[PDB]
Design a protein around this ligand. Structure first.
Ligand code: ZN
Ligand code: ZN
Ligand code: ZN
Length: 178
């Protein structure tokens, strides 16, 4: 296996996937790595396995259909993997922990949101539909855009939002369009 966590790229205490060569710190992997499980497989393998067992699940879907799906075990896993793909981009540090808002000319967001909040809200089965998870991830980036106004630090929202959307279309097989 690899010598650096797949998500964060650093060495440390790691756990190795038994089916693929990736490796993970405990709370870098989503869900957080399970006690025993021998063999273990990772969320990269377990998403793969879904596609292989139902190849038509890679056919195009409409975002409206995808959002209204209940958060059954397989939609839970996709939301868990989609989130993990955002933590993989180093610019996710800016959105990880709780934010505070004190800038001249700006007011903070009516509803704050951050990546560890959404992580915990996934872990705690607080979302019933995919619409729930998506609406939070999109609030993270819409709050940042409105708060940092014309300052060039806005862009980091746009960049980590682009990483989100692209993996959303991939993982949920949204119908490609121009
Ligand atoms: Zn890590
Ligand atoms: Zn794996
Ligand atoms: Zn089939």
């Amino acid at each position: 296996n690899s010598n650096i966590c797949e998500v964060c790229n650093k060495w440390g205490r790691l756990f190795c996937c038994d089916t693929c060569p990736r490796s993970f710190h405990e709370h870098c992997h989503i869900p957080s790595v399970e006690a025993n499980k021998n063999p273990w497989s990772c969320i990269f393998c377990r998403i793969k396995t879904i596609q292989e067992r139902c190849p038509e699940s890679q056919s195009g879907h409409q975002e409206s259909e995808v959002l209204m799906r209940q958060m059954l075990p397989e939609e839970q896993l996709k939301c868990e993997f989609l989130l993990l793909k955002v933590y993989c981009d180093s610019k996710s540090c800016f959105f990880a922990s709780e934010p505070y808002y004190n800038r001249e000319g700006s007011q903070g967001p009516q509803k704050p949101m951050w990546l560890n909040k959404v992580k915990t809200s996934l872990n705690e089965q607080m979302y019933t539909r995919v619409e729930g998870f998506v609406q939070d991830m999109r609030l993270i980036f819409h709050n940042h855009k409105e708060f940092y106004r014309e300052d060039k630090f806005t862009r980091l929202g746009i960049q980590v939002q682009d990483i989100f959307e692209k993996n959303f279309r991939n993982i949920f097989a949204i119908q490609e369009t121009s």
